[PDB]
Amino acid sequence: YVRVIYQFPDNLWWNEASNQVYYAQDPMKPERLIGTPSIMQAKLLKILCEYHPSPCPNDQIIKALWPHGFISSESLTQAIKRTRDFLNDEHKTLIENVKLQGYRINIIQVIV
């Protein structure tokens, strides 16, 4: 299997196969499980992972989250807000808003 595991600052782990996000209370020990994201949290995470390290423009983010939807940018803002909330990113470091160029996700390493 092509397994991709993403390591994020504050030793966050996102496992793509199980679609699970968990705090590491050790180097890579899974015991503190933040949980399972919904089917847009995962989509936007996939978008920001596929464009790393380049910022992703908002238009393509919306076209990937809503392929056939006339969705206002308010839903974009609050989707980013809720994804950062459920990742416990109150310091705006995990999903950074590239000023006047879109969004980036802070990812340290990829394990295959």
Place this chain on the structure above:
DNA sequence: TCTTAAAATCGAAGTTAATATAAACTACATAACAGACATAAGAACAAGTTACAGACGTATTACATAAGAAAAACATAA
């Protein structure tokens, strides 16, 4: 009371569209124009919050059917 000078008036409409000759210099203060800066107003991007909708997921309700247990009836042996 008799001349004699002033004063006032003289149809409507319609039309009816400019002229046009003829000192110099100096000093000073004030107004106007142009350039630059800071400020109030404005726009764009992103974030927080508060709520309602939408379809999924939970609990209340009424059962179908099949396995298990009790009981009544029957056949058999003493």
